[PDB]
Design a protein around this ligand. Structure first.
Ligand SMILES: CCCCCCCCCCCC(=O)OC[C@H](COP(=O)([O-])O)OC(=O)CCCCCCCCCCC
Ligand SMILES: CCCCCCCCCCCC(=O)OC[C@H](COP(=O)([O-])O)OC(=O)CCCCCCCCCCC
Lengths: 365, 365
């Protein structure tokens, strides 16, 4: 019952988003290739009980997006070497006291530098730095059994990363650039539906996830339609804030939807028809820009503000001749409708920055 | 230069927040005790090159808050056993094909169940389940060298967790309940400062982080002032949303601060004095509730709405006799001030739910 229903919902999510099955199958295939290689090409126990670092490196350095693998791994690459670099300094350097004090001070400094301000996301390298240094110190005591146990833990962790890179980079690439288009376009549609729902309701009564993907996207090679290196992936994040202004405005509109001083609807149903036209014509420019961005038409947004500007102006010179319903429990309701409509003209006025911010991007791209 | 300045800023942050130094020192002490114990009580190499699981368990199962350690570890506890539980089923169970198909299907199902909906936070147990099963399968091939290499990797990982629990639970406990008070009180003050800044500006011209802590807090024992088990840690999160309503309102106020249709200030400086009194008297009830929550006075919020209600009503019957500035480029500005003031009365009206939601909590506590 519950299991079947959950599986069904997951199935619709998977067919809607086919990346889930592909990514899971890719991880499965990488684990199978590593296990098969170990169990076939090494039946001779030169080393067959200390290779659990290959499975671990495969399961840890493999992520959803290609930019993630390349850029996040490079953080781990310098992170492992930095701890190793100081390790050689403190391996050659009466012995046990120095060992303990070093292993305590280095951990202290690493932890303090990892709990600092806005890097609470650049943190895997510091865990790497702690673990590498602790690993070297818990085992390097001998200098006779050093290399034999040390390189048997580096070669196998390197030839798990090689495969986890090749398989991920040459089977269904999940390029971070495309997901940026998917996020920047879905925003337009969902905001448009939000405005439509906002305006429909008074008459009905009887950049964290967008700039992180930019950091990933600066490392992925020019795929197909992204022509040259250093593609201007700086204006996709600047268009998002331009829309986020209007997102705040429509959020205020919804806060007006669910207010506690709502108007006496019989009174509101006098100025009741022009709002719908303003909303309908405002949704159109917002859907058309999304359509322009999705296929990336290099023809330009030529003067789309016309209909919405005319609608806004006609709304402006309609609130004014019929201003008898807005001014003089009872008094508070009157100004509410004025606050109600005064936001929408602000939406149209703010809609202009979006057009400029997309015209500059369509030229810079 | 840069290093000294960064260190200084970190020093002020640390003296302001002494938990950073304490937590880092505690991790350092745990690493030192583990390393000292290994290097002193085991100079005899029964096993001294395979205990790197003690250092790892210490560095991974140790977190900031006590509730984190106990509850997150329990997720790991059943996570490791669940994979181990099926492992015995698929160890007794012609051999290699079954091995590969099992290690692929189990990984597939675990990954799919980990990339599901709103658990993107309950995910460490699934990594644990993958790693345990892969570990067992990459090594259990022998059944003669099984136990010797297996228990030498369980005893040491258990007696790193024992110390990482004891040290964290009996040296400067960082109880999750107290941080809930700190977050629920800081909110009142910062929102009050936000309102004060909002109202000061038109005349100046010439629950993700609160409900997660609740889940942690349900596992920590009754410390001191929290009397009995099953303390009502359900109303601290319900008061936060009651304040979040007004947070949305003041966010709309700030959106009005930075609008593009701002009023011609010479015109606004006519109805200019009562807003300041309304804001000042509204900040007071908002600071006093924070003071009531901070020390948790069991005396009750007895009729604090009086001053703010009177201020709101006097504002109401002031917009109305002077309504000549609000109605009839020029027309749009007029209704702006009406939207301006119509929000504030909504703030006072919404302020009532907060008092009820805190009166019920002060009785239930
Ligand atoms: C060159 C490019 C490398 C690209 C990526 C290579 C590694 C990627 C790191 C991903 C996670 C990882 O491998 O862990 C580092 C391990 C210890 O971690 P764990 O296995 O305990 O989780 O620590 C170790 O593997 C031990 C190795 C320490 C010896 C390595 C340095 C030897 C001297 C190098 C100087 C050039
Ligand atoms: C009992 C309460 C325990 C409380 C916590 C104990 C462990 C806490 C887990 C924290 C992380 C951890 O230990 O990793 C699990 C390891 C493999 O992980 P890693 O060392 O590769 O990172 O996997 C292993 O350690 C291998 C152990 C597998 C044998 C354990 C099960 C044996 C049969 C148990 C049945 C009762």
């Amino acid at each position: 019952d519950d299991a079947k229903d959950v599986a069904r919902k997951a199935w619709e999510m998977g067919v809607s988003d086919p990346r889930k099955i592909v990514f899971s199958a890719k991880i499965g295939l990488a684990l199978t290739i590593v296990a098969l290689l170990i169990f076939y090409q090494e039946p001779n126990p030169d080393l067959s009980r200390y290779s659990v670092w290959a499975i671990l490196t495969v399961v840890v350095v493999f992520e959803f997006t290609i930019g993630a693998t390349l850029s996040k791994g490079f953080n781990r690459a310098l992170g492992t070497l930095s701890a190793g670099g100081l390790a050689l300094g403190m391996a050659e350097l009466w012995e046990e006291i120095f060992c303990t004090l070093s292993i305590f001070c280095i951990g202290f400094l690493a932890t303090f530098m990892k709990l600092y301000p806005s890097m609470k996301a650049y943190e895997y390298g510091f865990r790497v730095f702690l673990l590498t240094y602790c690993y070297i110190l818990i085992s390097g005591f001998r200098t006779g059994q050093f290399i034999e146990v040390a390189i048997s833990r580096f070669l196998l962790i390197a030839l798990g990363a090689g495969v986890s890179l090749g398989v991920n980079m040459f089977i269904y690439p999940i390029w971070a650039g495309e997901d940026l288009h998917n996020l920047v376009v879905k925003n337009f549609m969902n905001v448009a539906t939000s405005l439509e729902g906002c305006v429909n309701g008074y008459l009905r009564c009887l950049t964290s996830q967008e700039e992180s993907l930019m950091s990933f996207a600066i490392w992925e090679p020019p795929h197909g339609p992204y022509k040259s290196f250093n593609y201007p992936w700086k204006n996709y994040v600047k268009l998002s804030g331009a829309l986020k202004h209007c997102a705040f405005t429509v959020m205020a509109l919804h806060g007006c939807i669910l207010s506690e001083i709502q108007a006496p609807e019989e009174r509101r149903q006098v100025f009741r028809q022009e709002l719908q036209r303003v909303g309908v014509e405002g949704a159109k420019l917002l859907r058309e820009l999304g359509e322009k961005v999705k296929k990336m038409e290099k023809l330009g947004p030529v003067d789309l503000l016309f209909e919405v500007h005319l609608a806004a102006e006609e709304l402006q010179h309609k609130i004014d001749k019929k201003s008898y319903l807005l001014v003089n429990y009872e008094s508070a309701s009157a100004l509410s409708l004025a606050t109600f409509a005064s936001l929408l003209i602000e939406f149209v006025a703010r809609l202009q920055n979006v057009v400029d911010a997309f015209k500059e991007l369509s030229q810079k791209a």
